[PDB]
Design an enzyme around this catalytic site. Structure first.
Site, short mmCIF file in Angstrom:
data_model
loop_
_atom_site.label_atom_id
_atom_site.label_comp_id
_atom_site.label_asym_id
_atom_site.label_seq_id
_atom_site.Cartn_x
_atom_site.Cartn_y
_atom_site.Cartn_z
N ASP A 36 0.82 -1.25 0.00
CA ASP A 36 0.00 0.00 0.00
C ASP A 36 0.84 1.27 0.00
OD1 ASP A 36 -2.48 1.72 2.20
OD2 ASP A 36 -1.99 1.90 0.03
N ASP A 222 -0.87 5.38 -5.82
CA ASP A 222 -1.46 4.57 -4.71
C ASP A 222 -1.81 3.16 -5.17
OD1 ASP A 222 -2.72 3.49 -2.46
OD2 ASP A 222 -4.43 4.82 -2.38
C1 LIG Z 1 -5.56 0.14 1.00
C2 LIG Z 1 -7.02 -0.22 1.35
C3 LIG Z 1 -7.10 -1.66 1.85
C4 LIG Z 1 -7.47 0.67 2.48
C5 LIG Z 1 -8.97 0.44 2.73
C6 LIG Z 1 -9.52 0.53 3.98
C7 LIG Z 1 -10.91 0.34 4.11
CL1 LIG Z 1 -11.54 0.41 5.79
C8 LIG Z 1 -11.74 0.08 3.02
C9 LIG Z 1 -11.20 -0.01 1.74
C10 LIG Z 1 -9.81 0.15 1.58
C11 LIG Z 1 -9.09 0.12 0.24
N1 LIG Z 1 -9.88 0.40 -0.81
C12 LIG Z 1 -9.72 0.04 -2.24
C13 LIG Z 1 -10.02 -1.35 -2.79
C14 LIG Z 1 -9.29 -2.38 -2.01
C15 LIG Z 1 -9.64 -3.22 -0.81
C16 LIG Z 1 -10.89 -3.15 -0.05
C17 LIG Z 1 -12.13 -2.76 -0.52
N2 LIG Z 1 -12.87 -2.77 0.61
N3 LIG Z 1 -12.14 -3.10 1.67
C18 LIG Z 1 -10.86 -3.32 1.33
C19 LIG Z 1 -8.68 -4.12 -0.37
S1 LIG Z 1 -7.26 -3.99 -1.35
C20 LIG Z 1 -7.94 -2.80 -2.37
BR1 LIG Z 1 -6.86 -2.12 -3.84
C21 LIG Z 1 -10.13 1.23 -3.05
O1 LIG Z 1 -10.85 1.96 -2.39
O2 LIG Z 1 -9.90 1.50 -4.24
N4 LIG Z 1 -7.84 -0.02 0.18
#
Ligand SMILES: CC1(C)Cc2cc(Cl)ccc2C(N[C@@H](Cc2c(-c3cn[nH]c3)csc2Br)C(=O)O)=N1
Ligand SMILES: [Zn+2]
Ligand SMILES: [Zn+2]
Ligand SMILES: [Zn+2]
Length: 393
Positions: A36, A222
């Site tokens: 990340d 990102d």
């Molecule tokens: C880095 C991370 C895990 C941080 C995160 C925290 C939370 Cl609480 C929800 C989504 C995310 C999130 N969102 C992504 C999608 C995603 C996810 C995810 C989606 N929902 N929860 C995790 C895991 S790895 C990835 Br790439 C996005 O918003 O584009 N990324």
């Protein structure tokens, strides 16, 4: 831990990120950890969860030390919280060193881990300034470079529910992972991997916005984000332009919102109606830029549901932001990206793992010179909260 040892060390599920194997503790607990570049905490699930089957067990690590301080990490749409500690950390398919790093043992979370994919933790690769609870919590990569002789750089080849692979080269650049030229853009400020976009074109047509609009209120690289996310004004202009180009096909609003798939009979998708998108990034030389060009094969993501599995179906993976431009997986899958923290810069070259047309290719091209390069960065309004805090560092 050669660069050949580090090639193909990432795996993931489509739209659920990329993870790398790490070992924490003594004796070694192996976990899959999301890479990340948009945050700065090393955090690992450390208690049962319906969607985990392993987690980091502090009590099984002879080398674990509790810092006796909790942390709470809120997101727009979920959270994690846990207990800070330190432990010995290794990357099995990475450099042949071991380091004592900060680790947040995650004890409660919401909408953080989800069904299917197979990571138990996150490796925040960005800078101390955005670490939680504050920037005194040294990030993993900082600890890696301070404790070993690993060069202060890493690189990411992300190759694009379907299974995905790629490589994180820790402390170097591997020339087998990319073709043609490597272009560098300055890291504007060490917090996020913040960059500056100077121009945006959709099928060679300039969006003709004030270039500060492109970086409102920041632009970041990102690997933790799936989409290319764009500021609201920018996102609207882009959709108008993409819509114009693809006008032989009239999609529902849900599609443009990323809330609905559109499909064509297998093999028949008209890729040629969907334009390429070129983002011009500030060059190292004043008045220079270079462009990174992505195909619709990067911004239109395949999704396989059932009954009509005979159709190829797609989600639109450009979305609206209120937090600036985010160059997520949609962009990064086109490219080999070098996070050259030593030289405060990010490089882009065309990736060896191209998802590409018989007639078109994702490109990295420059220079493009400007007379009267305006300043395209946005200055975030300084809050009293941020103005007051002392940093004796
Ligand atoms: C880095 C991370 C895990 C941080 C995160 C925290 C939370 Cl609480 C929800 C989504 C995310 C999130 N969102 C992504 C999608 C995603 C996810 C995810 C989606 N929902 N929860 C995790 C895991 S790895 C990835 Br790439 C996005 O918003 O584009 N990324
Ligand atoms: Zn392994
Ligand atoms: Zn002080
Ligand atoms: Zn500080």
């Amino acid at each position: 831990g050669s660069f050949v040892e580090m090639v193909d060390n990432l795996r993931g599920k489509s739209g659920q990120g990329y993870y790398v194997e790490m070992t924490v503790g003594s004796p070694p607990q192996t976990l899959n950890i999301l890479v990340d570049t948009g945050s700065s905490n090393f955090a690992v699930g450390a208690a049962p969860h319906p969607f985990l089957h392993r987690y980091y067990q502090r009590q099984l690590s002879s080398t674990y030390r509790d810092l006796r301080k909790g942390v709470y990490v809120p997101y727009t749409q979920g959270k994690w919280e846990g207990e800070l500690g330190t432990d010995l950390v290794s990357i099995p398919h990475g450099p042949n060193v071991t380091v004592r790093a900060n680790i947040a043992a995650i004890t409660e979370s919401d909408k953080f881990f989800i069904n299917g994919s197979n990571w138990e933790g996150i490796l925040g690769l960005a800078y101390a300034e955005i670490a939680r609870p504050d920037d005194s919590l040294e990030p993993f990569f900082d600890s890696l470079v301070k404790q070993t002789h690993v060069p202060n750089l890493f690189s990411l080849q992300l190759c694009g529910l379907a299974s995905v692979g790629g490589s994180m080269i820790i402390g170097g650049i591997d020339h087998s992972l990319y073709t043609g030229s490597l272009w560098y853009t300055p890291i504007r400020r060490e917090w996020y991997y913040e960059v500056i976009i100077v121009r945006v074109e959709i099928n060679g047509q300039d969006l003709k916005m004030d270039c500060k609009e492109y970086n409102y209120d920041k632009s970041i690289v990102d690997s933790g984000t799936t989409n290319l996310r764009l500021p609201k004004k920018v996102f609207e202009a882009a959709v108008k332009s993409i819509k114009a180009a693809s006008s032989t096909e009239k999609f529902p609003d849900g599609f443009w919102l990323g809330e609905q798939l559109v499909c064509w009979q297998a093999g028949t998708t008209p890729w040629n109606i969907f334009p390429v998108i070129s983002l011009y990034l500030m060059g190292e030389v004043t008045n220079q830029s270079f462009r990174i060009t992505i195909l619709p094969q990067q911004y239109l993501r395949p999704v396989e549901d059932v009954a009509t599995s005979q159709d190829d179906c797609y989600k639109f993976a450009i979305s609206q932001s209120s937090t600036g431009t985010v160059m997520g997986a949609v962009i990064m899958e086109g490219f080999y990206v070098v996070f050259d923290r030593a030289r405060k810069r990010i490089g882009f070259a065309v990736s060896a793992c191209h998802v590409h047309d018989e007639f078109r290719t994702a490109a990295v091209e420059g220079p493009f010179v400007t007379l009267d390069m305006e300043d395209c960065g946005y200055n975030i309004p300084q809050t009293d909260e941020s103005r007051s805090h002392h940093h004796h560092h």
